[PDB]
């Protein structure tokens, strides 16, 4: 059910900052893929720091094997969006409720996703 | 690791040095932080958003990255990143123990043979730095308040030793530095977001020497007094070239070697007193500026005493023989004791003159000596003052050009920028006005060329009795009637240049003809700017003193002032025509000479070309199959008899007969005959050497030759006649289409040529010619000329960069695989409007303009930029970037004529460099133009008898050695595999140095000519006494236990 499942470390942090209370947006590298991303993740009540290794997993669905639209409980950070341009070393623009998130990698790597439907991006820090 | 600063990423705009200085020293050790600094936009209350701070150790330094890397460093909400630093904030060396505060400074000389050393000023307290990074020694001294900065490079000093000062051989007390070059010399010069930890808000600017008694400048050694220093060894064990002995010194009172003037390692004249000759004292000066004879070992009296009763010529022997041994000499009265018309003839048959050269430095001054060099036009007249004549150049330390902020540095005072001038710019005034003074003798400003005023270097006469440098310089012409600064000297420094001697023709067959000149869209463009006739009787009668059997169609010359290449007509009224927009200035003589008459030598293809032709359409595979093709062709050289004379007959001299050239068509094996093997290696070594350095590619269908036009009128704009000769390639088969047998020798063409110079920096240069076939014009008897139209819109010289008809050379080539089809109008050649002054010149403001050139000199940059431009950004030489680049160096190349400087804007400056430069301390990117591709491919490629030959192995061991040589290869193909720092930066002191050793090398081969032919004067005899000379040099046997050279009998 999982579509796209990677770990990602983070390289820098745009606003870089403890006590900023604002969206910080990350930068990570993937291991074995080599894959860019930005993602904007509040750090108060998720904190992540440079150099943490944490896994990235995206689902169109959280069900087990149908019912589109429990993978909960293996998580800590899900969230929904949809993806609305594919328009690329090809890259997708996934809009989690007005966070932007931006994964580039490789045509071959990301194939198999549509336009405007709606996933799922599951996140653990290890 | 290599330097303690480190550049934090992101700091808060809101903070001050003070605060993030507390921050460190808080989460770091205590006073752990040495200098701290935040850049402003503004001058001081717009800090940016990063900050450079450098710690006192790399421990530190480590401990800050490893809890950066932590994200540990928390400054006000805010994650400081530390990174790696370009540049320190201060030269200041990590290690405690190199740096060294209160230590006695001392210099001087090896006045003695033994162990004794003289000092001639003392300094205390000095400070000294040891940079091993830079590779240089900084020495801080304090005289009268301000404090003085001198550094010793590495390089500088040749080799290091040890001594003691407080007389126990235990001990080492004392440092001696030989230091080959001179020091340079600094001056300091008089808060908010800086800490610095101490007083280092300055700045460093160059200046002469600060001595009252000139004591750095005489002197070519320091000592470091300093303490027992039991560890001190391992520090100075990294100084090149160090000496593992231990060695003591005696101090001697050499403080009565005091010279107050401004050059001072020349010897006192009041000391001797007496009728010493100039020119042995002129040596002994110039054995003493070099390291091989120190003055106090020289202003003995013994020396001079026995020095004066002596005949001349083993006078000159002897020391010429001191001179050129490598090791110094530390007692020359023993060696000197265990030791024991033409000029006039050579000027006429092949103008050799010996020029005393100079070389001044901010320190001190290097005199080069006696070199025999060409000759110009003036010693013609002149040559019985030979000695008089001194070439002198300002250079650097290093003999390197000077930089622009070694003069006129620049300082914001007031409202606008204002520069400063610094003492050098001051010295470099006062040596031109006051002059030097070489013993018996002043040497007086007489001009400069128009080559020399790029090289920095100028011409002084020493003022006689007889003759005066303003009688010499009245002589040459009156320039008064100029009245731009640039201009007269131009018109002053123009008459210099070598030519051969000919015919006196008077002033009554002159004759004045109209010019012609269209002005068309309020242009005003003249088709007759150099232009000239001539007729065959007066060829013919010009061509017998130089030894022409071809008489040339057109040849450059220059007489009276007048400058300008002239054609050979058949109808012309007598032997001597002129045109008006010639005479540059009235001069009182008319003196006949010519420069160079016709040469086919095949053109090449320049970096520029190249850069230009990669837009029109022209693709990369026919350049890389070229290359390819010619790789191929060389390396078959070697090993191929029949490559060689093809290689050697259409790459340089489409006609010349040497000694290799005759071998090469008949000869043994390559494995066989060593003597040639080794020159044709050489000569391949030099090849691949060349390619390397920059692109030049041999084609067989293109030459370079001087164009005229004619005053016929039938050829329209766009149409031209081209004939050049025939080569090996074009005897072998004549038949092509663009190709017109017109003669057994001369080939006409009837392709589509293109004309370019060579500066080129612009796509409208570029321009598609078509050649046609006339009888009439084939009747005039045209050859090796281009005949440009006399009638049309704009004259062709001005299409190609705004040329001139002065003689200079043209790229032709009939190649049919260019593309014809893109055209672009060429800039406009309208230049800056003269500078024209409201009285006479003084003589000093030709001097200001003459020193002003160093600084804001920038034709040098301009086209490396360009040519970094071109490689980076696509559709090269169309964006306004180039056409800016390409006005900035028409600018600059005007600038030897009108005094308007270039002006090189920071912005434009590259910042990067391709793979095939040089600079490899520079940051090196990789390219993946045309250039890239072909260094790519070859970096692919690549990866009675018995006295007459001792005398001339003496002769060529002691020009090897003179000249610096070790091989015979390096010295009789003139080029030298190992160069100085200062040679290999700029090419036209390297090829006058060629010029010299060949014209040595020729010299002594003329000389082994004449003594042959007067040891036998019997022609089959001497045939026979020359087989005898191949035979001894050939058996291995008879091979002496010194080097025995085998390039003796080869001389024809």
């Excluded at chain 2, 990117?925 to 003496?954: C, N, P, Q, W």
Aim: charged share 25%; proline share 4%.
């Amino acid at each position: 059910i999982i579509m796209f499942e990677d770990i990602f470390v983070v390289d820098k942090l745009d606003p870089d900052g403890k006590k900023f209370d604002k969206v910080t947006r990350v930068e990570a590298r993937s291991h074995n893929l080599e894959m860019f991303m930005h993602l904007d993740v509040n750090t108060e009540v998720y904190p992540l720091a440079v150099g943490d290794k944490f896994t990235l997993a995206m689902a169109p669905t959280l069900n087990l094997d149908g019912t589109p639209d429990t993978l909960a409980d293996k998580y800590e950070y899900i969230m929904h969006g949809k993806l609305y341009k594919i328009s690329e070393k090809a890259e997708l623009y996934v809009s989690f409720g007005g966070l932007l998130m931006l994964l580039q990698g490789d045509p071959a790597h990301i194939s198999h996703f549509e336009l405007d439907q709606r996933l799922f991006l599951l996140m653990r820090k290890l | 690791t290599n330097r303690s600063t480190v550049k934090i990423s992101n700091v808060p705009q809101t903070i001050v040095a003070d605060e993030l200085l507390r921050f460190l020293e808080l989460h770091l050790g205590e006073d752990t932080v040495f200098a701290l600094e935040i850049p402003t936009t503004r001058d001081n209350w717009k800090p940016r958003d990063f900050a450079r701070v450098q710690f006192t150790t790399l421990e530190v330094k480590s401990r800050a990255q490893l809890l950066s890397s932590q994200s540990k460093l928390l400054f006000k909400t805010h994650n400081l990143r530390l990174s790696e630093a370009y540049d320190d904030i201060i030269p200041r060396p990590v290690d405690p123990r190199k740096r060294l505060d209160d230590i006695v400074l001392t210099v001087g000389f090896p006045e003695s043979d033994e162990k004794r050393f003289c000092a001639l000023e003392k300094w205390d307290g000095v400070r000294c730095w040891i940079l091993t990074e830079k590779r240089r020694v900084e020495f801080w001294v304090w005289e009268s308040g301000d404090c003085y900065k001198i550094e010793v490079r590495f390089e500088d000093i040749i080799e290091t030793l040890s001594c003691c000062v407080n007389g126990d051989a235990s001990e080492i007390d004392a440092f001696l530095l030989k230091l080959k070059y001179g020091p340079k010399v600094f001056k300091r010069v008089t808060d908010r977001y800086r800490f610095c930890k101490e007083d280092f808000d300055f700045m460093w600017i160059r200046t002469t020497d600060f001595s009252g008694s000139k004591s750095i400048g005489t002197s070519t050694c320091f000592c470091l007094e300093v303490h027992n220093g039991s560890t001190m060894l391992d520090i100075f064990s990294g100084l090149p070239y160090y000496r593992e002995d231990t060695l003591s010194l005696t101090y001697v009172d050499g403080k009565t070697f005091a010279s107050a003037a401004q050059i001072v390692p020349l010897l006192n004249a009041a000391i001797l007193g007496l009728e010493f000759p100039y020119e042995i004292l002129f040596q002994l000066n110039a054995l003493v500026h070099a390291q091989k004879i120190s003055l106090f070992a020289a202003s003995d009296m013994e020396l001079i005493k026995i020095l004066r009763g002596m005949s001349l010529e083993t006078a000159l022997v002897i020391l010429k023989k001191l001179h050129q041994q490598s090791s110094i000499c530390y007692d020359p009265v023993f060696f000197v004791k265990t030791q024991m018309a033409s000029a006039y003839k050579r000027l006429t048959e092949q103008n050799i003159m010996s020029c005393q050269r100079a070389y001044v430095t901010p320190s001190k001054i290097y005199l080069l000596g006696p070199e025999l060099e060409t000759a110009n036009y003036v010693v013609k007249n002149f040559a019985e003052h030979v000695s008089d004549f001194m070439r002198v150049t300002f250079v650097e330390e290093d003999w390197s050009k000077l930089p622009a902020n070694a003069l006129s540095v620049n300082s914001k005072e007031g409202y606008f920028v204002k520069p400063s001038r610094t003492n050098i710019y001051n010295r470099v005034l006062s040596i031109l006005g006051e002059g030097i003074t070489v013993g018996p003798k002043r040497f007086e400003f007489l001009a400069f060329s128009a080559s020399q005023l790029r090289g920095n270097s100028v011409w002084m006469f020493a003022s006689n009795e007889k003759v005066k440098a303003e009688d010499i310089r009245e002589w040459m012409g009156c320039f008064r009637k100029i009245r731009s600064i640039s201009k007269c000297a131009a018109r002053m420094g123009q008459l210099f240049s070598a030519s051969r001697q000919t015919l006196i023709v008077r002033a009554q067959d002159v004759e004045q003809i109209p010019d012609i000149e269209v002005t068309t869209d309020g242009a005003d463009y003249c088709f007759s700017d150099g232009i000239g006739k001539i007729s065959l009787a007066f060829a013919k009668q010009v061509a017998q003193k130089c030894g022409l059997s071809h008489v040339p169609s057109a040849f450059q010359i220059r007489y009276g002032g007048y400058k300008g290449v002239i054609a050979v007509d058949r109808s012309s009224f007598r032997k001597l025509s002129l045109r008006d927009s010639m005479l540059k200035f009235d001069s009182n003589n008319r003196m006949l000479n010519v420069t160079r008459w016709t040469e086919s030598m095949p053109c090449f293809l320049n970096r520029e070309i190249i850069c230009l032709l990669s837009t029109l359409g022209i693709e990369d595979a026919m350049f890389e199959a070229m290359q390819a093709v010619h790789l191929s062709m060389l390396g078959n050289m070697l090993e191929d008899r029949d490559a060689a004379l093809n290689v050697l007959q259409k790459l340089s001299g489409e006609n010349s007969k040497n000694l290799l050239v005759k071998m090469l068509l008949q000869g043994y094996a390559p494995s066989s005959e060593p003597y040639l093997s080794m020159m044709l290696r050489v000569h391949h070594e030099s090849q691949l050497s060349e390619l390397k350095s920059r692109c030049r590619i041999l084609v067989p269908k293109g030459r370079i030759l001087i164009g005229c036009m004619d005053e016929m009128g039938i050829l329209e704009y766009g149409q031209v006649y081209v004939r050049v000769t025939l080569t090996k390639a074009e005897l072998k088969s004549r038949d092509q289409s663009y190709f017109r047998k017109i003669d057994e020798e001369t080939s006409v063409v009837i392709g589509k040529v293109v004309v370019t110079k060579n500066p080129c920096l612009h796509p409208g240069d570029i321009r598609v010619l078509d050649a046609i076939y006339e009888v009439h014009f084939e009747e005039k008897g045209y050859l090796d000329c281009i005949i440009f139209p006399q009638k049309g819109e704009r004259p062709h010289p001005n299409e190609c960069s705004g040329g001139d008809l002065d003689g200079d050379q043209f790229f032709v080539s009939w190649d049919e695989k260019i593309i014809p089809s893109e055209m672009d109008p060429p800039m406009d050649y309208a230049g800056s409007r003269p500078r024209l002054m409201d009285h006479d010149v003084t003589l000093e403001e030709i001097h200001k303009f003459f020193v002003d050139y160093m600084i804001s000199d920038t034709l040098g940059v301009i086209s490396t930029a360009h040519l970094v431009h071109a490689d980076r950004d696509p559709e090269k030489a169309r964006s306004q970037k180039c056409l800016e680049l390409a006005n900035l160096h028409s600018r600059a190349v005007d600038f030897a004529k009108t005094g308007a400087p270039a002006e090189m804007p920071y912005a434009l400056k590259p910042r990067e460099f391709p793979d095939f430069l040089e600079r490899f301390e520079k940051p090196t990117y990789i390219s993946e133009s045309v250039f890239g591709k072909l260094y790519r491919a070859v970096k692919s490629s690549l990866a009675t008898a018995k006295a007459h030959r001792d005398m001339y192995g003496e002769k060529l061991t002691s020009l090897m050695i003179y000249y610096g040589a070790a091989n015979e290869e390096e010295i009789l193909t003139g080029i030298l595999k190992t160069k100085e720092m200062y040679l290999a930066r700029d090419n036209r002191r390297y090829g006058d140095m060629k010029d010299r050793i060949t014209l040595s090398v020729k010299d002594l081969h003329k000389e082994a000519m004449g003594w042959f032919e007067k040891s036998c004067e019997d022609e089959q005899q001497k045939k026979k006494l020359a087989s005898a000379w191949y035979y001894v040099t050939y058996n291995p046997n008879h091979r002496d236990e010194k080097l025995t050279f085998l390039s003796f009998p080869w001389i024809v």
